[PDB]
Coordinates of C-alpha atoms and ligand atoms in Angstrom, one line a residue:
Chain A
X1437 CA 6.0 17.7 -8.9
X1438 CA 4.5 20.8 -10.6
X1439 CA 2.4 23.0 -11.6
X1440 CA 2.4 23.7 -15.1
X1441 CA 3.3 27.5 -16.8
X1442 CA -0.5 28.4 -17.2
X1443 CA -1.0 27.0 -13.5
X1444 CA -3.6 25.1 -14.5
X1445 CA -2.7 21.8 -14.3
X1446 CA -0.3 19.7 -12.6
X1447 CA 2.6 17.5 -13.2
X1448 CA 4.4 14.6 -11.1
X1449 CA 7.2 11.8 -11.7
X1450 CA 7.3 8.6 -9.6
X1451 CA 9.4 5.9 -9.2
X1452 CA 7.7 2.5 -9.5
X1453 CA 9.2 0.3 -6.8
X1454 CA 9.2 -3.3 -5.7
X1455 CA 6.4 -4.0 -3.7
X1456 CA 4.0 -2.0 -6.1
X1457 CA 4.0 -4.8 -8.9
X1458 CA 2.5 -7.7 -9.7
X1459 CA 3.3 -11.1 -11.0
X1460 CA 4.2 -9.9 -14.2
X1461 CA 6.8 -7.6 -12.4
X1462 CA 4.4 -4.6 -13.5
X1463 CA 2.4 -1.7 -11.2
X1464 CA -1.1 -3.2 -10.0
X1465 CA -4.3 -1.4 -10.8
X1466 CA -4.3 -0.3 -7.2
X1467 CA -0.6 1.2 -7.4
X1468 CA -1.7 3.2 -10.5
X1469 CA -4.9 4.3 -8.5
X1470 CA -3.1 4.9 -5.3
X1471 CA -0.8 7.4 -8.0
X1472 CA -3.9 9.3 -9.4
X1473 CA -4.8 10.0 -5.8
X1474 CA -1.6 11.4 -4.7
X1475 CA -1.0 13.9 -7.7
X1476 CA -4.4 15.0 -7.0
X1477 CA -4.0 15.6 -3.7
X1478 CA -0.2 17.5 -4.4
X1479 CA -2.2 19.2 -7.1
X1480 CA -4.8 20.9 -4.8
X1481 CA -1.9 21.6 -2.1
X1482 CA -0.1 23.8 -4.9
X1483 CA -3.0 26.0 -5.6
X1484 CA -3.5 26.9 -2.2
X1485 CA -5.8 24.3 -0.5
X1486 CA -4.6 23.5 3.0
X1487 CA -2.8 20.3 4.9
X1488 CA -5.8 18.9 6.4
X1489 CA -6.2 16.5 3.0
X1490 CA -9.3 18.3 1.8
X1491 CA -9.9 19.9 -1.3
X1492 CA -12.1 22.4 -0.1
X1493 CA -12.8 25.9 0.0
X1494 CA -13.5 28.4 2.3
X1495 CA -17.2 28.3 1.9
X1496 CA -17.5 24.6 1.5
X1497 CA -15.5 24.4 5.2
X1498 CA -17.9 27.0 6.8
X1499 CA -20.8 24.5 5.3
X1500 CA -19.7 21.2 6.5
X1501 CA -19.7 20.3 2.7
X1502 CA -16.8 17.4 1.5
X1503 CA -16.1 16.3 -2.2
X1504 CA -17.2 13.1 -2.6
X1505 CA -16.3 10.1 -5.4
X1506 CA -19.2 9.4 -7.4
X1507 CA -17.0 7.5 -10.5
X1508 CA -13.8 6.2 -11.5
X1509 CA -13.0 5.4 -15.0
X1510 CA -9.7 4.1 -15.8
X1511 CA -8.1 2.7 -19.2
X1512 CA -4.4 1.1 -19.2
X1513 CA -2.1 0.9 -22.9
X1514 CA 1.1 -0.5 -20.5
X1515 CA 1.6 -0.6 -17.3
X1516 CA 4.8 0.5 -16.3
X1517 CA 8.2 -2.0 -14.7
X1518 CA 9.7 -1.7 -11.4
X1519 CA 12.1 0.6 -11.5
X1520 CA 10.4 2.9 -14.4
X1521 CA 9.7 6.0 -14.4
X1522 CA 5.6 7.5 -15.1
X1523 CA 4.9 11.0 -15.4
X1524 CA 1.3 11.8 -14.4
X1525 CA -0.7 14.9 -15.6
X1526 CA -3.7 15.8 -13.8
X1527 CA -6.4 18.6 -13.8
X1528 CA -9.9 19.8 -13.0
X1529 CA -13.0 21.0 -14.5
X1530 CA -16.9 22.0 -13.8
X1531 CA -19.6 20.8 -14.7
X1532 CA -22.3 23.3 -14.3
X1533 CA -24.0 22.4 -11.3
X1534 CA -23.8 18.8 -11.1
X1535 CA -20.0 19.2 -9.9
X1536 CA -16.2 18.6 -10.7
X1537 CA -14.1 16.3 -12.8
X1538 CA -10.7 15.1 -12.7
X1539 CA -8.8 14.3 -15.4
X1540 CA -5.3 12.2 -15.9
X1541 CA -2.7 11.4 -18.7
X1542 CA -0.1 8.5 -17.6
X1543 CA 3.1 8.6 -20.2
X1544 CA 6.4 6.7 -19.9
X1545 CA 8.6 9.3 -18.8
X1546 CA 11.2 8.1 -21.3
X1547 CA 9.5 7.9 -24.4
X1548 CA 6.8 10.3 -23.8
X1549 CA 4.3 7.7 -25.2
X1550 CA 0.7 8.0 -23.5
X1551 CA 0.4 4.7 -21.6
X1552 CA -3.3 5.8 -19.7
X1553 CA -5.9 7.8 -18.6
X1554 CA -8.2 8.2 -15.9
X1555 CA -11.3 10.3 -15.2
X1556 CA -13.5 10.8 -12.2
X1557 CA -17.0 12.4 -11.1
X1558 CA -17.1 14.2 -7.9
X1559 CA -19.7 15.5 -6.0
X1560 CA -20.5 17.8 -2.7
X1561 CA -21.7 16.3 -0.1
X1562 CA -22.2 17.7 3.7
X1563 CA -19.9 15.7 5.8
X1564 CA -21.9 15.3 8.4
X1565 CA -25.7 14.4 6.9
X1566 CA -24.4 12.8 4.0
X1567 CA -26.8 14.2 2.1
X1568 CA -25.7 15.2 -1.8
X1569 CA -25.9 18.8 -2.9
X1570 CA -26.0 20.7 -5.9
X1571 CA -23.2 23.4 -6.5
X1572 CA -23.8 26.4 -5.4
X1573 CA -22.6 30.1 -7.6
X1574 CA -20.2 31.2 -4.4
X1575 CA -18.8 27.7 -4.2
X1576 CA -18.1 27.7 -7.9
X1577 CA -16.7 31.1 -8.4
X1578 CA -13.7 30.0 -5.4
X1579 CA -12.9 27.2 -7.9
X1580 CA -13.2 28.4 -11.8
X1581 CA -9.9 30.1 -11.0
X1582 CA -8.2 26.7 -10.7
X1583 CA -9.7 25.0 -14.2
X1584 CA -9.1 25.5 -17.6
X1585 CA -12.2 27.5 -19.2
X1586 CA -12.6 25.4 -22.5
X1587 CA -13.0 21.8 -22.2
X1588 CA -10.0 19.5 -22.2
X1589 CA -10.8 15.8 -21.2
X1590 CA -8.8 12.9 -21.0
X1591 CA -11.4 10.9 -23.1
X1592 CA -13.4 13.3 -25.6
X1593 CA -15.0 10.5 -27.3
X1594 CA -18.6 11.8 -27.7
X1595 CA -20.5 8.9 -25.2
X1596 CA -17.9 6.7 -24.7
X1597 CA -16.8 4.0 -22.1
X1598 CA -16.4 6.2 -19.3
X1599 CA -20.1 8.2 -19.5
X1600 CA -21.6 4.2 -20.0
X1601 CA -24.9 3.5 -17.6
X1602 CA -23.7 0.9 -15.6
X1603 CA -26.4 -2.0 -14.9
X1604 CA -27.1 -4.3 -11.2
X1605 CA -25.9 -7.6 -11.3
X1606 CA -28.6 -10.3 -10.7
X1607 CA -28.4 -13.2 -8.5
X1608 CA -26.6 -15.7 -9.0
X1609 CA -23.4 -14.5 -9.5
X1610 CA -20.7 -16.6 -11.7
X1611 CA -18.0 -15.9 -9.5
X1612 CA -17.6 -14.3 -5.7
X1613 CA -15.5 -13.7 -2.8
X1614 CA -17.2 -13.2 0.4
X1615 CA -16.5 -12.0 4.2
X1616 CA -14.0 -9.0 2.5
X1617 CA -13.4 -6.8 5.9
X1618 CA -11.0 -3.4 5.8
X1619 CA -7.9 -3.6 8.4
X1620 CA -6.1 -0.4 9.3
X1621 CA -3.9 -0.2 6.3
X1622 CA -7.1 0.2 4.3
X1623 CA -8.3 3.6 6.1
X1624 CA -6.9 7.3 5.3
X1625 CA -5.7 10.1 7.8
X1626 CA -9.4 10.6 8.6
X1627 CA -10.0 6.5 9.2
X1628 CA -12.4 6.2 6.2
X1629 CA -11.8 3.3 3.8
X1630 CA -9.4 4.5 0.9
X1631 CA -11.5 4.4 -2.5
X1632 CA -8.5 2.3 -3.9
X1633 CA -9.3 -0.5 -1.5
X1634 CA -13.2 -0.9 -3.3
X1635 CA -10.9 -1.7 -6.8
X1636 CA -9.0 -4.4 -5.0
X1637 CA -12.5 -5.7 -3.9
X1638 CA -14.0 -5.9 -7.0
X1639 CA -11.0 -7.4 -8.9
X1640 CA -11.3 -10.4 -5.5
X1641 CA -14.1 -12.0 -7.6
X1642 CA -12.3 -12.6 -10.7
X1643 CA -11.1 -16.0 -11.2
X1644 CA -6.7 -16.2 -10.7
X1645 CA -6.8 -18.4 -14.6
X1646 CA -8.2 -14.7 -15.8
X1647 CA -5.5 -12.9 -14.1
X1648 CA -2.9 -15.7 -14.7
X1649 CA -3.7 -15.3 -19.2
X1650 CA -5.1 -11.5 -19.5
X1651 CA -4.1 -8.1 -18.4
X1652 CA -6.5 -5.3 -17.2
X1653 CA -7.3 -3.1 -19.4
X1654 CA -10.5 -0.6 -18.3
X1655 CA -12.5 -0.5 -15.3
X1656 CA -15.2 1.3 -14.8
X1657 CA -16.6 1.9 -10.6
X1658 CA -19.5 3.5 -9.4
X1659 CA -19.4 4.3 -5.5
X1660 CA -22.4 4.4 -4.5
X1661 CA -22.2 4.3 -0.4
X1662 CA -19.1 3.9 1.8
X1663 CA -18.4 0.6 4.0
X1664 CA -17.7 1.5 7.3
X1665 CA -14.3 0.0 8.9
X1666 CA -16.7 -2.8 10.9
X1667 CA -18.8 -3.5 8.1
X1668 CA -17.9 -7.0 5.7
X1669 CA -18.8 -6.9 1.8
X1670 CA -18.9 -9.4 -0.9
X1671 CA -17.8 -8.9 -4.3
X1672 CA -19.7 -10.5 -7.1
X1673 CA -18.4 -10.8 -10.5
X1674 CA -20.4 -11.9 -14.1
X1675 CA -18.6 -12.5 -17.3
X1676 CA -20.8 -10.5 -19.8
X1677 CA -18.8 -11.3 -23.0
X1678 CA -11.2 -9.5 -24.8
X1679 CA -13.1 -10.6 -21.4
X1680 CA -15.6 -8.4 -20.1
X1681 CA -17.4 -8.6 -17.0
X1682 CA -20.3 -6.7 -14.6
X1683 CA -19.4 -6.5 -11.0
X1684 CA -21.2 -5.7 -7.1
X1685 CA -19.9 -5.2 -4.0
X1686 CA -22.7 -5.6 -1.5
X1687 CA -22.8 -5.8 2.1
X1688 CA -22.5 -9.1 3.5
X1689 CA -25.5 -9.2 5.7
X1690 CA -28.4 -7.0 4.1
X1691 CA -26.8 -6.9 1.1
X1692 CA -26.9 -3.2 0.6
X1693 CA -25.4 -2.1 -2.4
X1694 CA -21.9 -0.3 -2.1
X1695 CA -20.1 -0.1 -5.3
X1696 CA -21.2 -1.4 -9.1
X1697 CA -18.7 -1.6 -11.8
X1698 CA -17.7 -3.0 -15.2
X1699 CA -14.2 -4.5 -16.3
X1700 CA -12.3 -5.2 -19.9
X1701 CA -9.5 -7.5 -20.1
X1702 CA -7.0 -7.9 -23.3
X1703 CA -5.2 -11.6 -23.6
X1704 CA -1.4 -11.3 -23.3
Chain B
X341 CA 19.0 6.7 -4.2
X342 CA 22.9 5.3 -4.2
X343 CA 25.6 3.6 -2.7
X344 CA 28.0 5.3 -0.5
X345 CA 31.5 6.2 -0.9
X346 CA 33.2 2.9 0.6
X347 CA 30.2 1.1 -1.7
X348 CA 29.4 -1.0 2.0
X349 CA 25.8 0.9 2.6
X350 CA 23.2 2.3 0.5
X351 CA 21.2 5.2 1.2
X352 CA 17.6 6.8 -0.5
X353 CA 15.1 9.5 0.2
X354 CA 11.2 8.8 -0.1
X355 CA 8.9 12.3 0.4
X356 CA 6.0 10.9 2.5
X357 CA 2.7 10.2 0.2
X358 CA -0.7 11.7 1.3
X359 CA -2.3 7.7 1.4
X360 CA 0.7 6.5 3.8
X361 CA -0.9 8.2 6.2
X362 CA -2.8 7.5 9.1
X363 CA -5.0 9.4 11.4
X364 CA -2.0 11.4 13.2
X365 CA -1.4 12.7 9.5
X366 CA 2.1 10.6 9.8
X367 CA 3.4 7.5 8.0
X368 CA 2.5 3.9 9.4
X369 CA 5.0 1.4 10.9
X370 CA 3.1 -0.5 7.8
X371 CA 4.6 2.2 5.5
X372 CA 8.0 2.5 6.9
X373 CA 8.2 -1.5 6.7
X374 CA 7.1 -0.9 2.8
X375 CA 10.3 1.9 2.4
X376 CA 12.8 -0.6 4.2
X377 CA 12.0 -3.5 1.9
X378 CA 12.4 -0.7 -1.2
X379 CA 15.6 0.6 0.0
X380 CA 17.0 -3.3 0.6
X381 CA 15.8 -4.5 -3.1
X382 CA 17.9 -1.0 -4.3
X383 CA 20.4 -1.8 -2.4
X384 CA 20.6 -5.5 -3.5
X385 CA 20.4 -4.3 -7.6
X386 CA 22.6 -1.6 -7.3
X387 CA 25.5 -4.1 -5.6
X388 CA 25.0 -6.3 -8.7
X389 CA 21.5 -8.4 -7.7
X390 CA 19.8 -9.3 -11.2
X391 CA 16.2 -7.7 -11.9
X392 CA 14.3 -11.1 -10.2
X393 CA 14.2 -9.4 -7.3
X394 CA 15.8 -11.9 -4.8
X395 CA 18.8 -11.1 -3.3
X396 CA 20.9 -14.2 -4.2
X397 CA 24.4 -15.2 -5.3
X398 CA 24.9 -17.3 -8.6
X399 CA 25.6 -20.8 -6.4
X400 CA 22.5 -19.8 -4.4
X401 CA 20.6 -19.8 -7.5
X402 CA 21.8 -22.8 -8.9
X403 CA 21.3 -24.5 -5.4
X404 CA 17.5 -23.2 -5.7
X405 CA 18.5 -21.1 -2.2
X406 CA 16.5 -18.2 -1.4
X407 CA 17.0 -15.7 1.7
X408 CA 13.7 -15.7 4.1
X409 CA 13.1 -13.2 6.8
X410 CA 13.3 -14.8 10.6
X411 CA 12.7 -12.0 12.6
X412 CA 12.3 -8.1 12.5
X413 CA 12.7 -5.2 14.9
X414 CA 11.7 -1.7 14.5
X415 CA 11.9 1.3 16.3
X416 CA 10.7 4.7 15.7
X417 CA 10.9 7.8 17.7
X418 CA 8.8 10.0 15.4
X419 CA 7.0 9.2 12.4
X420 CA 7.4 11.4 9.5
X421 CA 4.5 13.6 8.6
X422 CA 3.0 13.2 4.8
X423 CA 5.5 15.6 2.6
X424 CA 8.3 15.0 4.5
X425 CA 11.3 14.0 3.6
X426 CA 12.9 10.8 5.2
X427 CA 16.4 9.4 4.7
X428 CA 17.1 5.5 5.1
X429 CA 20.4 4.1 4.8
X430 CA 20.7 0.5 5.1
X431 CA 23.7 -2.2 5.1
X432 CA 24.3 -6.4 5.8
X433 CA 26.4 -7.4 7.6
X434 CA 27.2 -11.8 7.9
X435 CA 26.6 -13.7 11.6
X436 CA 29.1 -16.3 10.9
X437 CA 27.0 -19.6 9.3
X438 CA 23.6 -18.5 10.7
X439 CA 22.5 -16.1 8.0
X440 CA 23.0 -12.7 7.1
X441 CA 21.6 -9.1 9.2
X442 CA 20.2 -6.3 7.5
X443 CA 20.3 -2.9 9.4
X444 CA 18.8 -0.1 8.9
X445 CA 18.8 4.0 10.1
X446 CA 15.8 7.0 9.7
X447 CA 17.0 10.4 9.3
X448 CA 15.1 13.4 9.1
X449 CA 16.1 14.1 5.7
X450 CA 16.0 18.6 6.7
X451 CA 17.5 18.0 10.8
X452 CA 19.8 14.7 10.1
X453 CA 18.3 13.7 13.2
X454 CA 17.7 9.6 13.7
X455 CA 13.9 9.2 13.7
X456 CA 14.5 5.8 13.5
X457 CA 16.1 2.2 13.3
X458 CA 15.2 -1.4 12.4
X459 CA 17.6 -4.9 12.1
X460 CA 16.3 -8.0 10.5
X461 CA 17.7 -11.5 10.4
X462 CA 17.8 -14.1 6.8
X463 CA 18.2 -17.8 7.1
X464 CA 18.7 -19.3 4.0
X465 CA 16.6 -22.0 2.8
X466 CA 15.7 -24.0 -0.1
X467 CA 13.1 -22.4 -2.4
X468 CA 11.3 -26.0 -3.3
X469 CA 11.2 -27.7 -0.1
X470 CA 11.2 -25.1 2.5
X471 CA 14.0 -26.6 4.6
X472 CA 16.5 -24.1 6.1
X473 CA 20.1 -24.3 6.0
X474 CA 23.4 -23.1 7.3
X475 CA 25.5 -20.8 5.5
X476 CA 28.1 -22.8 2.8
X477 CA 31.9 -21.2 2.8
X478 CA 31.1 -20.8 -1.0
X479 CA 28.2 -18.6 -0.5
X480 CA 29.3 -16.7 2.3
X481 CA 32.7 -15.9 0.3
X482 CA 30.3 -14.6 -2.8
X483 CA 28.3 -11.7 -0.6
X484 CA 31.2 -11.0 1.8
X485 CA 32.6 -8.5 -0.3
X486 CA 29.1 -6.0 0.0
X487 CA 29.3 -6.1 3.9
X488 CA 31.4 -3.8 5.8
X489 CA 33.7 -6.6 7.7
X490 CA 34.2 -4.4 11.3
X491 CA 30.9 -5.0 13.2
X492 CA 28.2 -2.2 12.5
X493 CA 24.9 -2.3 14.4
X494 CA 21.6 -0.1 14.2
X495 CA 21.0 -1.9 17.4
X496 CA 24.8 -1.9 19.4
X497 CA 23.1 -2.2 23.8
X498 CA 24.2 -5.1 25.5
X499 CA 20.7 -5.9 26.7
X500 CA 18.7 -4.2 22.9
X501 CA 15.3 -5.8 22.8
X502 CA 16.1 -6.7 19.3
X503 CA 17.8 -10.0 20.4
X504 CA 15.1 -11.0 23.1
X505 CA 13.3 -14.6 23.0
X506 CA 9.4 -14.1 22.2
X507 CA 7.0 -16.5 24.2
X508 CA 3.9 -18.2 23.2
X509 CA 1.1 -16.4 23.6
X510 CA -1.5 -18.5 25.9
X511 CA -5.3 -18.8 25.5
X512 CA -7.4 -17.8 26.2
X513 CA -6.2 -14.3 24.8
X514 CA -7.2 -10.2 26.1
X515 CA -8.0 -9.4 22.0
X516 CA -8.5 -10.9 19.2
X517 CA -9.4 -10.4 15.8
X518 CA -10.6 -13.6 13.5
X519 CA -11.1 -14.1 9.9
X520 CA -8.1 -12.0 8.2
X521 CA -7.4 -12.9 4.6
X522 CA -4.8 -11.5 2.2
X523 CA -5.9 -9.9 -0.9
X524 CA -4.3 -9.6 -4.4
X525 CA -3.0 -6.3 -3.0
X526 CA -1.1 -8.3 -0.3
X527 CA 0.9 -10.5 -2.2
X528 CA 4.3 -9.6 -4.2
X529 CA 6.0 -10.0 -7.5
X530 CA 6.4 -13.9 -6.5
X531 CA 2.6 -14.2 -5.4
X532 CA 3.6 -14.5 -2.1
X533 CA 2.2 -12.7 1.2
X534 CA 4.5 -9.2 1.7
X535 CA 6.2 -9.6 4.7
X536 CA 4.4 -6.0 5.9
X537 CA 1.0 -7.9 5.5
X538 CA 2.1 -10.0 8.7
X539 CA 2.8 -6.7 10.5
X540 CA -0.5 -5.0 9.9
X541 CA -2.8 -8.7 10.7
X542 CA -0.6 -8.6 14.0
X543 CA -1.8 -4.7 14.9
X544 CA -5.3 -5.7 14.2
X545 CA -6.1 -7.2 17.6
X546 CA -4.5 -4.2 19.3
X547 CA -7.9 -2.0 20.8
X548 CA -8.6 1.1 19.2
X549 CA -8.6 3.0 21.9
X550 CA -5.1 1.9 22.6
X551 CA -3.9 3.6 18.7
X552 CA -6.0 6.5 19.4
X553 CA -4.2 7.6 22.8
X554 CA -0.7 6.0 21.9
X555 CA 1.9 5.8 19.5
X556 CA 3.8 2.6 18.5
X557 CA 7.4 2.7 19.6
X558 CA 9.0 -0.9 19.3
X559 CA 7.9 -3.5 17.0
X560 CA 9.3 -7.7 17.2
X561 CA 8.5 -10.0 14.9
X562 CA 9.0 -13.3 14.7
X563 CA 8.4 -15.2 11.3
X564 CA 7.8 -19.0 12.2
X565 CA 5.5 -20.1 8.7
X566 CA 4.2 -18.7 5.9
X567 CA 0.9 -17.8 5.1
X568 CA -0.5 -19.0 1.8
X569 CA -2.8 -16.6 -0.2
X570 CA -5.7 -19.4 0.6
X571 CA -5.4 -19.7 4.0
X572 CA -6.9 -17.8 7.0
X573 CA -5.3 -16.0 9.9
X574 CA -6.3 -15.1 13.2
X575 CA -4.6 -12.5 15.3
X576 CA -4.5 -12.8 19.0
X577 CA -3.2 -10.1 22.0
X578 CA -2.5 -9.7 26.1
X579 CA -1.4 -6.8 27.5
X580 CA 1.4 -7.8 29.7
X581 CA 2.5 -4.4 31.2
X582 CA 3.1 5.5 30.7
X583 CA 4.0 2.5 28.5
X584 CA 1.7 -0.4 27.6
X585 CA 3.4 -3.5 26.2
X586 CA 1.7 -6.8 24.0
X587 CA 2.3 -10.0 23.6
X588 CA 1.0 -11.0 20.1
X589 CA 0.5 -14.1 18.0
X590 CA -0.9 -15.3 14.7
X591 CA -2.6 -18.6 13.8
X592 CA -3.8 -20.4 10.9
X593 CA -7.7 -20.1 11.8
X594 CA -8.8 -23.6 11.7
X595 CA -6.0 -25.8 12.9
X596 CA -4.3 -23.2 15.1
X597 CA -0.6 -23.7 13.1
X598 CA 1.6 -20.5 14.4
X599 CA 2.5 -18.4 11.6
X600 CA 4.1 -15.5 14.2
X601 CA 5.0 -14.2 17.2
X602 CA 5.9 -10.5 18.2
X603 CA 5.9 -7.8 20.9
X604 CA 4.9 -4.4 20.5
X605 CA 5.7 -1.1 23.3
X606 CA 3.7 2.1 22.9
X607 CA 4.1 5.0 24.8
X608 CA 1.4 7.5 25.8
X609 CA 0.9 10.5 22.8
Ligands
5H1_548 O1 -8.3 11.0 -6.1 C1 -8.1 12.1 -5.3 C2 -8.0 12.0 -3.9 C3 -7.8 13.0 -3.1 C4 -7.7 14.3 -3.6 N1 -7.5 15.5 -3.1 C5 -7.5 16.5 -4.0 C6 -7.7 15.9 -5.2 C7 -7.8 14.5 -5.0 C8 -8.0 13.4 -5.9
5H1_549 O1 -12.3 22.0 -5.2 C1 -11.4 22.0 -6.3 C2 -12.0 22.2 -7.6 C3 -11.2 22.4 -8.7 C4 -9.9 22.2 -8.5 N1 -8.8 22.3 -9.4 C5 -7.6 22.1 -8.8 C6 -7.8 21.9 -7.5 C7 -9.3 22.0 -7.3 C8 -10.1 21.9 -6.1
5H1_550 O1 -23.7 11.6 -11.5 C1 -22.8 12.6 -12.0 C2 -22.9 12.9 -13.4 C3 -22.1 13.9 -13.9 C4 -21.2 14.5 -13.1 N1 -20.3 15.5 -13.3 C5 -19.6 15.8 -12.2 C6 -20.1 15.0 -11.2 C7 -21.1 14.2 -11.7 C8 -21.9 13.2 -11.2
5H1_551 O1 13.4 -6.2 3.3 C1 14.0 -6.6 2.1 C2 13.1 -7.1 1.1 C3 13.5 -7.5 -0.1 C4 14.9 -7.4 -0.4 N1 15.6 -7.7 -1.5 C5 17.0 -7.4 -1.2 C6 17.1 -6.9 0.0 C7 15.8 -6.9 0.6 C8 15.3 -6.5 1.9
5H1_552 O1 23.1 -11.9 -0.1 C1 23.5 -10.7 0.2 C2 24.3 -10.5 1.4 C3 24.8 -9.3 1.7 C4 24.5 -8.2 1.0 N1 24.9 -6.9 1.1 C5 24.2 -6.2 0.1 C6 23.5 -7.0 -0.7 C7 23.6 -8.3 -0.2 C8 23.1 -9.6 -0.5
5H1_553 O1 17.8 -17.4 14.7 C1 18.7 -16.6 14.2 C2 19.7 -16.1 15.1 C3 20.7 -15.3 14.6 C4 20.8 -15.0 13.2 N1 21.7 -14.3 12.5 C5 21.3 -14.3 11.2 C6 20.1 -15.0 11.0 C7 19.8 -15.5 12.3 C8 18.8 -16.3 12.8

């Protein structure tokens, strides 16, 4: 991967392979998501943040202060074979004070066609407290240099799917899979549950006839507070309506509210 | 990745990914399992294997014969960091009317140094009624001519602990940890449970403290059922030892049906 000419944005090719796909011999959600992570990660490694995985700076290490995942929003056209070939374009932005969001474009490598798009809210939080915080100026002026100045968003539609409130699902659920606990492969270099792993509990409550007849086609996650590696969560899932449905992770004793999200389905 | 000269082996280069990671900041035994089963499917299509994924002759496919894995061994001296570059080159080679081996090496893609080896044995068996079968002269004679045909091992020692008989894990056990269930995630194109899935459930009664202050070295697994994407597993470890060895096994939860067997050694960091 690269950066591009202006250095302000980044591109990367990968190879999808074998155990990535699905039934339908196509990447899952997951893979794609597990993608979008990695060319963010290579993308703040080539503009000089360092190899410990965070994508902070100087001041935000001297405060104990992390970005965190607030929202995911992403929207699928074609989801590519094994053996194909996506390109990914990724980049970053401000938001005043309220803090940073990144951007993707998925294409097919070959034909150049835009197959999807992904955006995602971030926030600073100290690492430590957990508490949220609002950007501060010196914090800001250490990242402007690595965002373009006028907007560019990967879905400019003036309140559209992925700036959508988001409501809580009420008891009782139509569909659920309890007793959903992380193993090791679940966690990242600094043993936290990978966001990606919250997606595949979500999609758990969907009935297999859904996935069996329909393909994904937006999700919509809001991460609301992490699950610890000994915690165990539920996933709830309500059809609202293409299929649409409302979703809730919760945990499986208090039921404490971890995640909340919406999904859109297309019929093959 | 490509085939080599002779067209007998395959070899491919994966850069390490930031998410097949683990606290060390180096790739998992589950992530190096992931890369071997890549470079074998790219191997297997690039020797003439259709798109379907499995690995199998015409007659096999007309038979409705699949290859299943029996047993795998891995061993790893150092783990590659995330950006680095390892090699893998892999080849089969035929044990007579038993089943086939696939072997495999680790390079450090920048030293050529071996980081690493694994070996794996396939039995053949029926894809319908799960019954397991020797090796037909007809099959064997349309696979024979991808395998190198002089003797070529990852794993040559007289005594390698690649070939040694696992035992059965007695209750009641030192560890254990109950309840594990594959998610969509886990399963592969065939909605099956990924081989690697059975690696990971077998790590998860190994102590923490034990991963935080060692590094896994040897890995044997023994593949005895399957495990269906409705079922439940438990995963149960004794210490039996600078090293610390395990005995390991996994059960269907309720009934107790073995699913595996293994042994891992880890040696101090
Ligand atoms: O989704 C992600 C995950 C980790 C990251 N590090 C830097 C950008 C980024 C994006
Ligand atoms: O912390 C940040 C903020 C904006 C960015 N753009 C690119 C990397 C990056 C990291
Ligand atoms: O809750 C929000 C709303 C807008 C945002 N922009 C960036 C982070 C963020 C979080
Ligand atoms: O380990 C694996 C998994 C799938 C495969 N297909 C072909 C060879 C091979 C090896
Ligand atoms: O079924 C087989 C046996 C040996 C092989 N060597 C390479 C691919 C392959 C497939
Ligand atoms: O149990 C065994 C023993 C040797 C083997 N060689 C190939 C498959 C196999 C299975």
């Amino acid at each position: 991967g690269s950066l591009t000419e202006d250095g302000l944005s980044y591109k990367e090719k990968f190879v999808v392979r074998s155990y990535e796909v699905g039934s339908n011999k196509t990447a899952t959600v997951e893979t794609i998501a597990n993608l979008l992570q990695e060319v963010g990660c290579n993308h703040a490694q080539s503009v000089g943040f360092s190899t410990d995985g965070f994508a902070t700076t100087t001041t935000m290490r001297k405060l104990h202060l992390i970005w965190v995942t607030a929202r995911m929003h992403i929207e699928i056209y074609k989801y590519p074979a094994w053996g194909d070939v996506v390109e990914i374009e990724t980049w970053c932005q401000s938001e005043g004070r309220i803090g940073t969001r990144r951007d993707w474009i998925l294409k097919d490598s070959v034909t150049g066609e835009v197959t999807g798009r992904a955006t995602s809210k971030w926030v600073m939080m100290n690492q430590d407290t957990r508490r949220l915080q609002k950007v501060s100026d010196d914090v800001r002026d250490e990242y402007l240099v690595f965002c373009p100045q006028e907007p560019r968003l990967a879905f400019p539609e003036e309140n559209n799917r992925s700036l959508k409130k988001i409501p809580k699902l009420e008891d009782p659920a139509q569909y659920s899979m309890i007793g959903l606990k992380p193993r090791r492969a679940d966690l990242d270099m600094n043993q936290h549950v990978n966001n990606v792993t919250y997606i595949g509990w979500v999609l758990e409550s969907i009935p297999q006839e859904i996935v069996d007849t329909h393909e994904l086609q937006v999700i919509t996650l809001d991460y609301r507070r992490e699950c610890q590696q000994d915690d165990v969560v539920d996933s709830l899932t309500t059809t609202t309506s293409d299929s649409q449905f409302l979703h809730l992770l919760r945990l499986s004793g208090d039921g404490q509210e971890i995640n909340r999200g919406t999904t859109l389905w297309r019929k093959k």
